[PDB]
Amino acid sequence: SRWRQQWSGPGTTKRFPETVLARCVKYTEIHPEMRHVDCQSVWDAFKGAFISKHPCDITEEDYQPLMKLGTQTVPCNKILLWSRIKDLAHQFTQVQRDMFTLEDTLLGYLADDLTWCGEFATSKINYQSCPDWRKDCSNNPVSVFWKTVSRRFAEAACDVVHVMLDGSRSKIFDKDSTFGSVEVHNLQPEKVQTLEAWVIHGGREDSRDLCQDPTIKELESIISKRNIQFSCKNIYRPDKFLQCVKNPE
Numbered sequence: 001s002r003w004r005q006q007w008s009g010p011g012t013t014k015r016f017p018e019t020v021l022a023r024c025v026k027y028t029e030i031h032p033e034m035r036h037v038d039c040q041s042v043w044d045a046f047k048g049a050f051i052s053k054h055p056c057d058i059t060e061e062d063y064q065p066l067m068k069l070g071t072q073t074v075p076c077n078k079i080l081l082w083s084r085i086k087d088l089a090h091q092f093t094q095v096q097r098d099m100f101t102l103e104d105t106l107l108g109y110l111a112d113d114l115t116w117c118g119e120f121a122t123s124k125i126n127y128q129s130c131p132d133w134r135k136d137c138s139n140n141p142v143s144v145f146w147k148t149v150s151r152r153f154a155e156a157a158c159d160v161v162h163v164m165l166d167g168s169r170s171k172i173f174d175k176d177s178t179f180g181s182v183e184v185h186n187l188q189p190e191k192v193q194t195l196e197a198w199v200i201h202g203g204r205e206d207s208r209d210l211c212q213d214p215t216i217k218e219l220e221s222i223i224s225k226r227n228i229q230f231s232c233k234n235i236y237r238p239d240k241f242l243q244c245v246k247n248p249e
């Protein structure tokens with residue numbers, strides 16, 4: 001458009017509509033329980049959330065239509081959260097197939113690793129640039145999507161929730177993360193009894209107990225205040241943790 005400003009973030013991912021549709025079909029092919037879903041309606045509601053809208057004023061209410069159509073019941077006691085250890089978290093749920101990350105749900109599978117935005121009063125997707133959360137604005141279509149769906153996934157969890165955390169990082173638990181700033185605060189104390197952390201070892205540092213780390217202690221404190229118990233395990237050898245998950249016989 002004639003009035004469209006430059007943003008600092010990458011533009012909408014190449015072939016976005018077509019990638020979303022193909023993913024919706026693919027997901028429902030592999031997951032027979034979701035075949036009631038009309039993928040054209042799914043796309044049309046996703047689109048309705050952000051096109052013709054200034055992409056610094058996107059709200060949770062904008063995505064409500066998408067949320068309704070994406071309604072999915074996962075077994076609430078088989079939930080895996082994670083923070084900066086994507087590869088191992090999803091390798092885990094590929095093998096232990098009764099456990100679920102957000103990206104194993106429909107809505108999460110669709111949006112995984114994609115960028116998108118539009119512009120006020122146009123029907124056009126902006127392929128040139130999109131708002132960066134830091135340099136531009138926080139209420140952008142991508143950020144608002146993930147905080148909305150991450151809240152609802154956490155709200156649905158029950159009994160024992162597991163979180164996988166990256167032990168090679170400087171801040172093993174990080175307040176400024178989806179886990180740290182959305183999910184820990186929206187687990188329901190009525191439904192959830194325990195949050196169990198799995199700290200995955202790697203990188204340079206020599207082998208020590210990482211459940212004694214200052215960020216883990218901070219985490220323990222944050223969740224205790226919410227009246228939910230905390231547990232923590234070291235996973236020293238990720239290599240052999242998958243081997244005995246995938247072949248316990």
Ligand SMILES: NC(=O)c1ccc[n+]([C@@H]2S[C@H](COP(=O)(O)OP(=O)(O)OC[C@H]3O[C@@H](n4cnc5c(N)ncnc54)[C@H](O)[C@@H]3O)[C@@H](O)[C@H]2O)c1
Nearest residue numbers: 082083084102103113142143146147150176177178179180
């Ligand atoms: N808001 C988002 O941009 C976003 C994007 C993708 C996924 N998610 C949420 S975060 C949650 C787990 O991640 P986290 O707890 O570490 O939260 P985060 O905000 O630190 O990470 C989210 C995203 O940041 C992105 N990112 C991380 N590091 C970099 C980086 N160094 N350069 C560019 N992008 C980066 C990457 O796409 C990652 O998936 C995941 O399951 C989803 O529910 C949020």
